[PDB]
Design a binder for this molecule. Structure first.
Ligand SMILES: O=C(O)c1ccc2c(c1)C(=O)N([C@H](Cc1ccc(O)cc1)C(=O)O)C2=O
Length: 358
């Protein structure tokens, strides 16, 4: 890499790994459109397998960026509308609290207090229906944001219904394949297990467990190469030759709601660039990120703003990830680690690197 990128990356990441006791890490910097890769430590401690550019990490809720783009792509295809009632795609959802709850509300965590987690009890299609039927909103639709797997998870499941495809097939054929993300998976195949890092929680090797709406909310695994390519695609959607996918990416970066200095997209979250690093850093802390916050509707939504800091944190029990990019500067970063360490440490390291190269 250019020495500038090398030095800022290593001088920022080395201390982070030490301070947080991170077993393995991969970083990609996208600088003037081109990716540069960095890796440290172990994908598998016990088997002494190092982190490489081919190592798969659990993205956790960074998966919501894929779900949001896939939803965008369905909109562009004319298959769904964000203004559609939820019941349009799930007529069995007859409980009266659902009146006025649209696909927009589901995608943007504004349905009125859907929970962070789908309960472990919920397994079957009939279990899921019962869960949403029984759910009682704390707030009217479109008044408060409460970050929720159960909200965008349901969005993803419904958004693919008109296509006739499973969520996984839709994602593979409409997002992964066109973008040549050939080492990105909802379900890791046996042939790729050699590359699948272990997550580490309290020193034990762990992988994410199956759960209702897992694929939609937190279930994507990917390499640093594919995630750099994901960032590139979201940095420059006009280079994408598939019309609906290009359009879907733009819709995922539109600003639907504002709370404080942040704007809600589909999966992605955005702030105006230049950002106050204390906003993104402190703002990334859970329970500001996971707290109930009133939202201002952006009527109509602002199309993707180039001068934005666009980002998403994500975790699983054993993994911590972060992606951030600034379209205007052709600049971005992906940080993948096999330990779930605090969001603020991720965003601080990310800002230190991008601010230096900016
Ligand atoms: O191991 C798992 O099963 C697992 C699954 C999904 C998530 C996490 C862990 C996880 O930590 N997040 C956070 C959100 C979250 C934070 C705290 C918490 O207790 C649950 C979820 C995120 O990525 O946004 C998740 O969304």
């Amino acid at each position: 890499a250019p020495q500038q990128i090398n030095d800022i990356v290593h001088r920022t990441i080395t201390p982070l790994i030490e301070q947080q006791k991170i077993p393995g890490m991969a970083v990609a910097v996208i600088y003037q459109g081109k990716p540069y890769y960095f890796t440290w430590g172990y994908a598998d401690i016990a088997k002494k397998q190092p982190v490489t550019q081919q190592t798969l990490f659990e993205l956790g809720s960074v998966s919501k960026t894929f779900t949001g783009v896939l939803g965008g792509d369905a909109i562009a295809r004319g298959e769904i509308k964000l203004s559609d009632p939820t019941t349009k795609y799930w007529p069995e959802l007859t409980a009266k609290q659902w009146n006025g709850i649209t696909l927009l509300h589901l995608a943007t965590y504004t349905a009125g207090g859907l929970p962070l987690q789908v309960p472990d009890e919920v397994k079957s299609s009939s279990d899921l229906l019962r869960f949403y039927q029984n759910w009682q909103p704390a707030w009217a639709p479109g008044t408060q944001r409460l970050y929720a797997n159960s909200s965008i998870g349901l969005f993803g499941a419904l958004a693919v219904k008109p296509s006739g495809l499973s969520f996984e097939q839709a994602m593979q054929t409409r997002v992964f394949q066109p973008l040549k993300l050939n080492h990105t998976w909802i379900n890791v195949p046996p042939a790729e297990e050699k590359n699948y890092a272990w997550g580490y929680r309290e020193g034990k090797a762990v992988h994410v467990s199956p759960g209702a709406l897992d694929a939609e909310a937190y279930g994507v695994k990917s390499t640093i190469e594919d995630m750099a390519r994901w960032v590139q695609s979201n940095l420059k959607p006009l280079d994408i030759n598939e019309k609906t996918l290009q359009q879907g990416i733009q819709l995922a970066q539109s600003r639907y709601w504002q709370t404080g200095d942040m704007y809600q997209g589909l999966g992605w979250e955005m702030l105006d660039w230049p950002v106050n690093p204390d906003s993104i850093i402190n703002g990334s802390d859970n329970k500001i990120a996971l707290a109930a916050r009133p939202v201002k509707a952006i009527t109509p939504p602002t199309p993707a703003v180039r001068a934005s800091w666009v980002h998403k944190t994500g975790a699983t029990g054993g993994f911590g990830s972060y992606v951030a990019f600034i379209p205007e500067k052709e600049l971005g970063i992906v940080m993948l680690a096999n330990k779930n360490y605090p969001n603020p440490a991720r965003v601080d390291a990310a800002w230190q690197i991008l601010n230096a190269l900016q």
